[PDB]
Amino acid sequence: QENQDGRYSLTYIYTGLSKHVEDVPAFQALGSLNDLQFFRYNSKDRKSQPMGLWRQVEGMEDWKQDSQLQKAREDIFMETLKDIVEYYNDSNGSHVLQGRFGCEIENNRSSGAFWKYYYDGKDYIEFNKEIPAWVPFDPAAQITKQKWEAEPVYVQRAKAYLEEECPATLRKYLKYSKNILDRQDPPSVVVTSHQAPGEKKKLKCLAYDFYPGKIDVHWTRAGEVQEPELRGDVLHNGNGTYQSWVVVAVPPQDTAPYSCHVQHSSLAQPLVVPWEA
Ligand SMILES: *[C@@H]1O[C@H](CO)[C@@H](O[C@@H]2O[C@H](CO)[C@@H](O[C@@H]3O[C@H](CO)[C@@H](O)[C@H](O[C@H]4O[C@H](CO)[C@@H](O)[C@H](O)[C@@H]4O[C@H]4O[C@H](CO)[C@@H](O)[C@H](O)[C@H]4NC(C)=O)[C@@H]3O)[C@H](O)[C@H]2NC(C)=O)[C@H](O)[C@H]1NC(C)=O
Numbered sequence: 001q002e003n004q005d006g007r008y009s010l011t012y013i014y015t016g017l018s019k020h021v022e023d024v025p026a027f028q029a030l031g032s033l034n035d036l037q038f039f040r041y042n043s044k045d046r047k048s049q050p051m052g053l054w055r056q057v058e059g060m061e062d063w064k065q066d067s068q069l070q071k072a073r074e075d076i077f078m079e080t081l082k083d084i085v086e087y088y089n090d091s092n093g094s095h096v097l098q099g100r101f102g103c104e105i106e107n108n109r110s111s112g113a114f115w116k117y118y119y120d121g122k123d124y125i126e127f128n129k130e131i132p133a134w135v136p137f138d139p140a141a142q143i144t145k146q147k148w149e150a151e152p153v154y155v156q157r158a159k160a161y162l163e164e165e166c167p168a169t170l171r172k173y174l175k176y177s178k179n180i181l182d183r184q185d186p187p188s189v190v191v192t193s194h195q196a197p198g199e200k201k202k203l204k205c206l207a208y209d210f211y212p213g214k215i216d217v218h219w220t221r222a223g224e225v226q227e228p229e230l231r232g233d234v235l236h237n238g239n240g241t242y243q244s245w246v247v248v249a250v251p252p253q254d255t256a257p258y259s260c261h262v263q264h265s266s267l268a269q270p271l272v273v274p275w276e277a
Pocket residue numbers: 190192204206208209236239241245
């Protein structure tokens with residue numbers, strides 16, 4: 001009777017667009033606790049709203065207050081994207097600035113942190129909290145490097161936000177979310193055959209209503225494992241559950257037995273469902 005393990009992750013993805021249409025929001029931000037997203041905010045609606053299972057959780061976060069400082073961040077974000085675009089003279093062109101910012105804890109202790117920006121998919125700038133300093137990866141990023149380090153203090157706060165302000169927020173959220181994130185829901189599995197007129201028969205094995213997401217689902221033909229013709233995976237965020245299915249194509253003659261094997265953490269011994277033809 002064996003391992004420790006309690007690692008939890010808090011991540012934000014920020015997205016801006018230089019050229020956007022009326023209905024499409026210019027700025028957007030969402031935050032995830034582990035693999036599940038707990039809140040979104042955009043520049044159109046201009047309101048911080050909780051998402052998924054976190055709609056029923058009260059008093060974890062002052063959403064009105066959060067909207068405020070989200071707005072603050074939106075300003076600094078787009079202003080940066082403007083500066084990149086203005087620098088490349090491509091004022092009229094559809095460009096993307098994406099920002100990833102986050103920390104994580106393992107066994108109650110800070111174990112890692114990251115703060116990185118991307119431009120049109122390419123590495124733009126990055127915080128090295130060891131120095132501490134920002135690290136340009138793009139010629140344009142030299143300007144931002146100078147702005148964000150204008151005062152020597154700024155670099156010290158950036159280190160503080162990652163190393164302390166973030167994990168502090170994480171733990172706070174964890175008081176309300178530990179129960180959610182720690183779930184070990186087993187999958188119900190369902191086998192289904194289907195025939196297309198001028199097509200080989202296809203056997204679908206669906207695993208559903210499970211969490212966490214890490215799952216092995218594979219077919220076997222008369223003992224040997226078969227490579228799937230197609231595999232599908234889904235996260236139902238409102239539900240806070242996962243769904244995953246695998247389809248194999250069985251030749252017209254084939255009389256050999258097919259069974260679906262599901263392996264998930266919430267199960268002691270593996271789950272096997274045979275296709276009762
Ligand atoms: C969280 O949310 C998700 C999505 O919002 C919910 O998904 C639903 O899950 C329930 C079970 O909790 C499913 O109920 C059905 O149960 C019977 C067994 O008693 C099964 O026969 C069903 O199996 C599905 O999949 C089969 C093969 O893949 C398919 O042949 C079958 O038709 C059925 O769903 C299919 O049919 C429906 C009806 O038209 C289609 O709408 C659906 O797209 C289709 N699915 C697929 C890809 O095959 C099935 O499990 C519901 O089917 C399922 N529905 C949805 C909208 O996803 C989930 O229930 C919920 N969980 C919790 C814990 O709250």
